[PDB]
Amino acid sequence: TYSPLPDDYNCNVELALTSDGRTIVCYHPSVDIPYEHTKPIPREEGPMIEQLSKMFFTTKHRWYPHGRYHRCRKNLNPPKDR
Amino acid sequence: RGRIPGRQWIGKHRRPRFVSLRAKQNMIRRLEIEAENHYWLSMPYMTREQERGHAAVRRREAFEAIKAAATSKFPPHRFIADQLDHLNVTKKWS
Amino acid sequence: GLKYPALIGNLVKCQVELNRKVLADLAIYEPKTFKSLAALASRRRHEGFAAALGDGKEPEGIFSRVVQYH
Amino acid sequence: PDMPTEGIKNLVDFLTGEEVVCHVARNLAVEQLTLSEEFPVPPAVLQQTFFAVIGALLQSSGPERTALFIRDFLITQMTGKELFEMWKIINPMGLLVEELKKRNVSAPESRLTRQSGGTTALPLYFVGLYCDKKLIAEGPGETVLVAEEEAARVALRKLYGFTENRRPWNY
Amino acid sequence: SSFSRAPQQWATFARIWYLLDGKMQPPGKLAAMASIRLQGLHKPVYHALSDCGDHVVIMNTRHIAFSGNKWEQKVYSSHTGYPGGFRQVTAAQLHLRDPVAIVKLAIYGMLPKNLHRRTMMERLHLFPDEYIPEDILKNLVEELPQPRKIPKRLDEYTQEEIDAFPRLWTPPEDYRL
Amino acid sequence: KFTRSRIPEKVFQASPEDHEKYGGDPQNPHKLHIVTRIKSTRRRPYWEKDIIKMLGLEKAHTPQVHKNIPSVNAKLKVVKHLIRIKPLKLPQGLPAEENMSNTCLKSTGELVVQWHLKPV
Amino acid sequence: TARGTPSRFLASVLHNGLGRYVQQLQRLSFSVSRDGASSRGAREFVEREVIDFARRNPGVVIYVNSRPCCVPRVVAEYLNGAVREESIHCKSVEEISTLVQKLADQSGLDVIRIRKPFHTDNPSIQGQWHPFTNKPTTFRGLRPREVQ
Amino acid sequence: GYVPKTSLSSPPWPEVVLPDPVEETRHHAEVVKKVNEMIVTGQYGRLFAVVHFASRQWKVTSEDLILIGNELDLACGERIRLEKVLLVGADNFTLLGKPLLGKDLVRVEATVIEKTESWPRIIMRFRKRKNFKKKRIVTTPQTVLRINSIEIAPCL
Ligand SMILES: [Mg+2]
């Protein structure tokens, strides 16, 4: 009956121990989203920069462009990872 | 606004440094270790009178070995092998 | 639902030595593993508290009791 | 065994396509021995030479050695390549409905589980797929339709056992 | 799990909205939690270059309760450009003339002192009343636990708990109070 | 003038309470100590540095054993504020010719001769 | 000096560790000089070490130019196409042997910042973490401040 | 010694209680048997192990690469068996020793691909008006490893 954490999200909690007490074992079965916990799918520079900032909730500094120095300093062939 | 004389760690006036709990606990544990060391250093075993010459042989042997190693200080030897192999810098093929 | 100092202490009080890099990697790419680790840490914390309160006699924590070596 | 014939044929055509073949040939120094014309060698001639070398290894060594070579090279070339990315499909809902009909007829009740924000130009809806009050899979997405498509794709992956939690291989 | 590359990335790097409430609570802990949620520290993938954060919405900023006597001690001063413009307004006056400034300055000072501070502040919203726009209301998701526990006045303990609490002394039967 | 700090005789005098607190005993005392420097040699006089160099404690947090004799006793006391002292009690016999490769120091002074890598 | 030097993520040329192991070293061209004191080591190598090195791994072919050269060089090609044209001017036989062994052991990958010494293809097994993790779900998923 | 319920009569944290030792051991044995049966049935998929090699704990999974900053004196193309694992699992279950796990319980198969060197690292030291200018280049050795697979047995 004891539960160190509430088993109501992500997965359950079941700490186990071996007979020798040398290795710990666990059983964390994933929790399924109930059926009653959902909802039915229902069915110019200055002004433009200000509108973009209000839409993206960002500052008006990064919207302006940069000189050719930073443009050329940018790497167009980044290292493909994964 | 807190204007104080030049250099806060010397002179007639200095900024008042205050102690915290970390330094207090550090000093406490250091004093505990020191008391443990003091207690451990309160129980001899030979009483001096029993150590009037129990290992002088080892000291004499070590001193003799050091003296022999020092007196051995002499330049190295020489061989004709290296002087003759130095001529191989112009090794030629057929 | 835990803190870093208590979590690290409980993890160290179980012979489960794990560096911080692996812990972060698991928390990032394995939420269930970190959840199980946090549950074990909370269990160890509760066991240690119960022991300090009642001095054991004679449970000694089912998860405690380090494995001796020679 | 849960994959259909169409998907298997598409995966075979992809592995035996041109990009992977060219990559393997260029990584095995095969292009340096391709007696062809107009350097660099085109992909068709390169693939033809690669298949000829495979047939040569077959006629020389044997079926077991060729199968081992295949398992070690071609099957290994598709380790990180996720499903669908290699076998492009259109309208995953149709394929999901077909698979369900093959298994059990039951319209998946597309339901919204979680949503982040709303009308903020940067949403994140977690569209699910309830199959008789029993969710089979789910996946997030930018919009609602894209989220449902991703959920259907993840459901198809789970059905075909191609998820990331599958078995690596047996060497 | 599976999840394709681009959708999985967009999901793991998504912006979530939260809701905070005052009503007889200190502003320090609220501002600290707001900054922790804005900087993305609450997430396990916290980093400045990643630009991870979450919008924080605070309501009922007019019912903030300070500890001690900070209402007549905390001076929110600010000097202007022209000379002699050294304004030294107290907390009570600043709240009476602007009830949406205390928590604002608290979160501004709590956040790091980098260029991302302005962006993290713009990501935050404040409202001095229960009225909230429909867009933000629909954007809100979940509600983290509140900081303070509220002392609870005598008009809420119910008569049952009051009767359960026994007396402690016996005043004289003829005490004029 | 900061002269050579000396120590009186009343300091090093273990009392029954001290013996009861620790595990040591007067009768049949230990024969070797476990010296381990826990403080740097810098910021200390030159004679203390010379004593530390003679005792062989260059690398801190390193175990060392010395004779438990009045001379070595005073040599240790000279830097007591810079070294950790503990007794070297051997549960079993001393390391014989056969027990020289499989050994271990172990904390709390417990030189084991049958050092293995298996659980109890 | 990493910002002013190209980098590359750690990865293999063909995942040789999974299946069969293929030698990344392709060919080796030695430019030894017959008459010249600037190639005694290369000559001694080609004399009493190159044969053993070639026989220790028959999956590599070696050439011997033996032309009038003033500085002996070695061209270490690779399958991917990289070339490591190093020089062995005045070097002992042991040094040249160790250099050849190192060249044969390494791959054609560039010698720059490796960044992250690990290439985990599928680092997520129990589901990648997302903002909607370790959180419950109210009845009917009713967002806060929602009547119906 | 009764204490009326007040704001500080009892601690703020919840006073939880642990179960009995007999039932706890029974549940432990039950979960161990369940995990053993699940492992025997072959339900796991894509295992992962935290191998503590080269004095570093790597979150190894499968088909991943590892680069060590030293030499091991091993011909490229030889199978290696790693040990010192202490965190094995996959989905719906985990395994960890105290600290290391049993040798017969886990088996990590790895191989060697290449033995390269590190990029030219530059060492430099400088001081103010002391004419201190020291320079040195270092190229430490490097290696590459590839874990083929991670086997597991029902040894419990
Ligand atoms: Mg001054």
UniProtKB/Swiss-Prot annotation, chain A:
One of its GO terms (molecular function) is RNA binding. Disulfide bonds: none annotated. Keywords: Mitochondrion, Ribonucleoprotein, Ribosomal protein, Transit peptide. One of its GO terms (cellular component) is plasma membrane. It is found in: Mitochondrion. One of its GO terms (biological process) is mitochondrial translation. Its main location: mitochondrion. Belongs to the mitochondrion-specific ribosomal protein mL42 family. Component of the mitochondrial large ribosomal subunit (mt-LSU). Mature mammalian 55S mitochondrial ribosomes consist of a small (28S) and a large (39S) subunit. The 28S small subunit contains a 12S ribosomal RNA (12S mt-rRNA) and 30 different proteins. The 39S large subunit contains a 16S rRNA (16S mt-rRNA), a copy of mitochondrial valine transfer RNA (mt-tRNA(Val)), which plays an integral structural role, and 52 different proteins. This is Large ribosomal subunit protein mL42. It comes from Homo sapiens (Human). The lineage of its organism: Eukaryota, Metazoa, Chordata, Craniata, Vertebrata.
From Swiss-Prot, chain D:
Component of the 39S subunit of mitochondrial ribosome. May have a function in the assembly/stability of nascent mitochondrial polypeptides exiting the ribosome. Component of the mitochondrial large ribosomal subunit (mt-LSU). Mature mammalian 55S mitochondrial ribosomes consist of a small (28S) and a large (39S) subunit. The 28S small subunit contains a 12S ribosomal RNA (12S mt-rRNA) and 30 different proteins. The 39S large subunit contains a 16S rRNA (16S mt-rRNA), a copy of mitochondrial valine transfer RNA (mt-tRNA(Val)), which plays an integral structural role, and 52 different proteins. It comes from Homo sapiens (Human). Its EC number is 3.1.26.-. This is Large ribosomal subunit protein mL44. It is linked to Combined oxidative phosphorylation deficiency 16: An autosomal recessive, mitochondrial disorder characterized by hypertrophic cardiomyopathy, liver steatosis, and decreased levels of mitochondrial complexes I and IV in heart and skeletal muscle. GO terms for biological process: mitochondrial translation; mitochondrial translational elongation; RNA processing. The keyword Transport does not apply. Its main location: mitochondrion. The keyword Hydrolase applies. Belongs to the ribonuclease III family. Mitochondrion-specific ribosomal protein mL44 subfamily.
UniProtKB/Swiss-Prot annotation, chain F:
Belongs to the universal ribosomal protein uL30 family. The gene is MRPL30. GO terms for molecular function: structural constituent of ribosome. It is found in: Mitochondrion. This is Large ribosomal subunit protein uL30m. Its main location: mitochondrion. It comes from Homo sapiens. Component of the mitochondrial large ribosomal subunit (mt-LSU). Mature mammalian 55S mitochondrial ribosomes consist of a small (28S) and a large (39S) subunit. The 28S small subunit contains a 12S ribosomal RNA (12S mt-rRNA) and 30 different proteins. The 39S large subunit contains a 16S rRNA (16S mt-rRNA), a copy of mitochondrial valine transfer RNA (mt-tRNA(Val)), which plays an integral structural role, and 52 different proteins. GO terms for cellular component: mitochondrial inner membrane; mitochondrial large ribosomal subunit; mitochondrion. GO terms for biological process: mitochondrial translation. It comes from the Eukaryota. Keywords: Mitochondrion, Ribonucleoprotein, Ribosomal protein, Transit peptide.
Curated annotation (Swiss-Prot), chain H:
The keyword Cytoplasm does not apply. Its main location: mitochondrion. Coiled coil: none annotated. Component of the mitochondrial large ribosomal subunit (mt-LSU). Mature mammalian 55S mitochondrial ribosomes consist of a small (28S) and a large (39S) subunit. The 28S small subunit contains a 12S ribosomal RNA (12S mt-rRNA) and 30 different proteins. The 39S large subunit contains a 16S rRNA (16S mt-rRNA), a copy of mitochondrial valine transfer RNA (mt-tRNA(Val)), which plays an integral structural role, and 52 different proteins. GO terms for biological process: mitochondrial translation. It is found in: Mitochondrion. GO terms for cellular component: mitochondrial inner membrane; mitochondrial large ribosomal subunit; mitochondrion. One of its GO terms (molecular function) is RNA binding. This is Large ribosomal subunit protein bL21m. Belongs to the bacterial ribosomal protein bL21 family. The chain holds residues 49 to 204 of 205 of the full protein. Keywords: Mitochondrion, Ribonucleoprotein, Ribosomal protein, Transit peptide. Transmembrane segments: none annotated. It comes from Homo sapiens (Human).
